Ligand binder design. Structure first.
Ligand SMILES: [Cl-]
Ligand code: NA
Length: 129
């Protein structure tokens, strides 16, 4: 499913992401925009053979099992395919563990490079939240 900007902001906010660990809602929407273009079905393969899955491009090297990343962890204890659902619940719950592991949203390279230090509130401007 391809989300609308405000549609996704609303879903993220209902799932507890607003100001989660100090990251305002615009941070999460900005990250999703540049990680996946708001597409829950986005997948991208990394050079080391792991794959990033879903709206937040969660990596199979650490966070989910896709059966083809040898020597990887499954810290969110879910199959990576559950992160491509139109329901963003699993992506959101997994994102909550990732952002809590000590590096904050720097775990998302697109957020670090494209959202960090910008006016992220502009990503929820105009939305009915
Ligand atoms: Cl980037
Ligand atoms: Na894995």
């Amino acid at each position: 499913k391809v989300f609308g900007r405000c549609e996704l902001a609303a879903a993220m906010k209902r799932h507890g992401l607003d100001n989660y660990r100090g990251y305002s809602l615009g941070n999460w929407v900005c990250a999703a925009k540049f990680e996946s273009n708001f597409n829950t079905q986005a997948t991208n393969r990394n050079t080391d053979g792991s794959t990033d899955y879903g709206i937040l491009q969660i990596n199979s090297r650490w966070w989910c099992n896709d059966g083809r990343t040898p020597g990887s962890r499954n810290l969110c204890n879910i199959p990576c395919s559950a992160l491509l659902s139109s329901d963003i619940t699993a992506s959101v719950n997994c994102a909550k563990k990732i952002v809590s592991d000590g590096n904050g949203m720097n775990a998302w390279v697109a957020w670090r490079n494209r959202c960090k230090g910008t006016d992220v509130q502009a990503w929820i401007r105009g939305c009915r939240l």
